[PDB]
Design an enzyme around this catalytic site. Structure first.
Site, short mmCIF file in Angstrom:
data_model
loop_
_atom_site.label_atom_id
_atom_site.label_comp_id
_atom_site.label_asym_id
_atom_site.label_seq_id
_atom_site.Cartn_x
_atom_site.Cartn_y
_atom_site.Cartn_z
N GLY A 16 2.15 5.95 10.38
CA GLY A 16 3.56 5.73 9.99
C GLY A 16 4.13 4.42 10.49
N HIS A 29 0.83 -1.23 0.00
CA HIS A 29 0.00 0.00 0.00
C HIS A 29 0.86 1.28 0.00
CE1 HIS A 29 0.09 1.05 4.31
NE2 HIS A 29 -0.39 -0.14 4.67
N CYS A 62 3.17 1.33 9.67
CA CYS A 62 3.08 0.22 8.68
C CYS A 62 4.49 -0.27 8.33
CB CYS A 62 2.32 0.64 7.43
SG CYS A 62 0.61 1.12 7.81
C1 LIG Z 1 -9.63 3.28 11.31
N1 LIG Z 1 -8.65 3.04 10.23
C2 LIG Z 1 -9.03 2.46 9.07
O1 LIG Z 1 -10.19 2.10 8.93
C3 LIG Z 1 -8.02 2.18 7.98
C4 LIG Z 1 -8.64 2.22 6.55
C5 LIG Z 1 -7.58 1.73 5.59
C6 LIG Z 1 -7.34 0.36 5.50
C7 LIG Z 1 -6.35 -0.12 4.66
C8 LIG Z 1 -5.61 0.76 3.89
CL1 LIG Z 1 -4.38 0.14 2.83
C9 LIG Z 1 -5.86 2.13 3.97
C10 LIG Z 1 -6.84 2.62 4.82
N2 LIG Z 1 -6.84 3.08 8.04
C11 LIG Z 1 -7.05 4.51 7.76
C12 LIG Z 1 -5.59 2.61 8.33
O2 LIG Z 1 -5.44 1.42 8.57
C13 LIG Z 1 -4.36 3.51 8.36
C14 LIG Z 1 -3.09 2.69 8.01
C15 LIG Z 1 -3.10 2.11 6.58
C16 LIG Z 1 -2.55 3.28 5.74
C17 LIG Z 1 -1.53 3.95 6.68
N3 LIG Z 1 -1.89 3.53 8.05
C18 LIG Z 1 -1.21 3.86 9.15
O3 LIG Z 1 -0.24 4.58 9.02
C19 LIG Z 1 -1.64 3.40 10.51
C20 LIG Z 1 -1.31 2.11 10.96
N4 LIG Z 1 -1.67 1.68 12.18
C21 LIG Z 1 -2.35 2.43 13.03
C22 LIG Z 1 -2.75 3.75 12.68
C23 LIG Z 1 -3.48 4.56 13.57
C24 LIG Z 1 -3.86 5.83 13.22
C25 LIG Z 1 -3.52 6.34 11.97
C26 LIG Z 1 -2.81 5.59 11.07
C27 LIG Z 1 -2.40 4.27 11.40
#
Ligand SMILES: CNC(=O)[C@@H](Cc1ccc(Cl)cc1)N(C)C(=O)C[C@H]1CCCN1C(=O)c1cncc2ccccc12
Ligand SMILES: CNC(=O)[C@@H](Cc1ccc(Cl)cc1)N(C)C(=O)C[C@H]1CCCN1C(=O)c1cncc2ccccc12
Lengths: 303, 303
Positions: free
Chosen positions: B143, B41, B145
């Site tokens: 950040g 991603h 990931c």
């Molecule tokens: C409630 N969050 C959601 O529903 C989903 C939706 C979604 C799913 C898959 C993809 Cl590929 C993109 C978006 N979202 C927005 C994320 O997982 C954010 C993730 C994926 C893209 C970067 N990212 C992060 O840096 C992230 C990772 N860990 C915890 C976090 C907590 C806070 C902020 C960001 C993060």
């Protein structure tokens, strides 16, 4: 999202751990520049651990009596010194993995990471707090002495704890890296016991702010209290007094959540008087006190 | 004595973490030999994260589109490949800090250490379990990931998790290091949600054995139960079934404590039906399920 007991990455400390052997006793040492630091009780036999004179025991030793091993590599001891309850073994080789470091003594209520070590080999890492009674609720077995506690600020390792002993209740006692004990404990077998302990109020409040940042809000109320009236309740439930300095330290978390510190104090009063009624906060059914305001800011979202 | 959420020392993994930047997106990669592994991603813009075709997005990229940094050192990308939900970036330099490693996929109920990373810099280490619903209750921010989960056996790092995303309840989803998701989750924005979860029964029993080894015995009783009658109670309280294979895995802890597994099952039945009556086990007021039998043996005394 989420909230865990989060240690510092241990790599910078793993490279400093060595095995120290004197006669039949093996424990861990900390190798920084050309000095290995370890508990002085490495020089004790076993029978003489009731009332050792360490000055007499050390004067009877020479450099060759100490075997120091950094993995497979033998470090020749070229000097030995006692500093309080630690031994300083001068070695022929400066540790090429020496990080930027400080020796800092921590306050009761402060947290640190422990790298538990056996035979100079790191086995695991966990978070600990210095209790108000100057014990730590560690996880240590035979051979863990010389394991260290630390915090990391940018690139700099702040060493705050070296492990010396276990008390009858299964809690732990040790020294700063200058060899000065935390609390009224001594490095010999006596009837010594952990003193009465209290709950770290400012940490419980920090953890309630972590819960609100993470979306647990069920314990919030419209009510407020005075600092004086809160401290009457704190005294009743064996909680540490809350100071204006603590209220100021909670300022950033108060600002971020928009919950006034004395409003959060009203929530804690209700949790103390009523309990949780079978509910949980951040996956705990009790009021957690081993996260500092710093730990919450370090780990939690800024929004 | 004592019992903590104990992670593996993180040093061997810290040396493998790098920053990966593609357009405006920065996340973490894992640098082993001459390959950097990261979530695919990283190649998405933002508007096209609703329904991306990753094969179309990747064919539009070249090696120069990927900036890889191991601290200050730039790693020139010389090849790119998609393997399921991970990107494999071939680089011009083999990681001189590559540990002995395996890519292993774990079972629900198994634990691992997480090294949480931001901008390719490790920030903290904690223990996690793979939940029965294939989520993890991690601690991750924007950040994070490409942060990885692992176990260490002797000198060998078994990588089991790469972090991809957060679900609406604040729990986390990711892949094995072959890029195959744990659970029914996809790397795009949908209405996907964590499924119903259960409590890991064999882990709760392991943790009651840890408590007995550490001298908490108040929950023990003279009573025994059958495996069938226990599993009726397990079903009622949303606990996983206990198998004969689980009873055999608890053999060593049963032998060490002299408490038969089905006797410990009778204790768990009473704790489920009655609660704790305001008491604690290993400093918890709830039944802990994120310690495996292995974790208990790893950490606890052998006597
Ligand atoms: C409630 N969050 C959601 O529903 C989903 C939706 C979604 C799913 C898959 C993809 Cl590929 C993109 C978006 N979202 C927005 C994320 O997982 C954010 C993730 C994926 C893209 C970067 N990212 C992060 O840096 C992230 C990772 N860990 C915890 C976090 C907590 C806070 C902020 C960001 C993060
Ligand atoms: C209940 N334990 C005690 O009362 C005290 C008495 C005593 C106090 C000070 C000194 Cl200098 C010597 C003895 N004891 C026996 C220890 O602290 C053992 C310590 C100190 C000597 C090695 N040692 C350990 O390897 C040790 C350390 N951490 C946890 C342990 C758990 C299990 C086994 C051993 C350990």
């Amino acid at each position: 999202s989420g909230f865990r007991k989060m240690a510092f990455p241990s790599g910078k400390v793993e490279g400093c751990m060595v095995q120290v052997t004197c006669g039949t006793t093996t424990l861990n040492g900390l190798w920084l520049d050309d000095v290995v630091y370890c508990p002085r009780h490495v020089i004790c036999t076993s029978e003489d651990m009731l009332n050792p004179n360490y000055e007499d025991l050390l004067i009877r030793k020479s450099n060759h009596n100490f075997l120091v091993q950094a993995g497979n590599v033998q470090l020749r001891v070229i000097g030995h010194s006692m500093q309080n309850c630690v031994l300083k073994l001068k070695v022929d080789t400066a540790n090429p993995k020496t990080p930027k470091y400080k020796f800092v003594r921590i306050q009761p209520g402060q947290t640190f990471s422990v790298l538990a070590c056996y035979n100079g080999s790191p086995s695991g890492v966990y978070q600990c707090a210095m209790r108000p009674n100057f014990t730590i609720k560690g996880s240590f077995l035979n051979g863990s002495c010389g394991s260290v506690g630390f915090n990391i600020d940018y690139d700099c390792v702040s060493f705050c704890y070296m492990h010396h002993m276990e008390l009858p209740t299964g809690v732990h006692a040790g020294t700063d890296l200058e060899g000065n004990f935390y609390g009224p404990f001594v490095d010999r077998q006596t009837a010594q016991a952990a003193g009465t302990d209290t709950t770290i109020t400012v940490n419980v409040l920090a953890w309630l702010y972590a819960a609100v940042i993470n979306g647990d809000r069920w314990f919030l109320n419209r009510f407020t209290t005075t600092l004086n009236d809160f401290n009457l309740v704190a005294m009743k439930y064996n909680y540490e007094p809350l100071t204006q300095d603590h209220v100021d330290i909670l300022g950033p978390l108060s600002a971020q959540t928009g919950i006034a510190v004395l409003d959060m104090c009203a929530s804690l009063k209700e949790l103390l008087q009523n309990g949780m009624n079978g509910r949980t906060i951040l996956g705990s059914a009790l009021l957690e006190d081993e996260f500092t305001p710093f730990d919450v800011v370090r780990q939690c979202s800024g929004v």
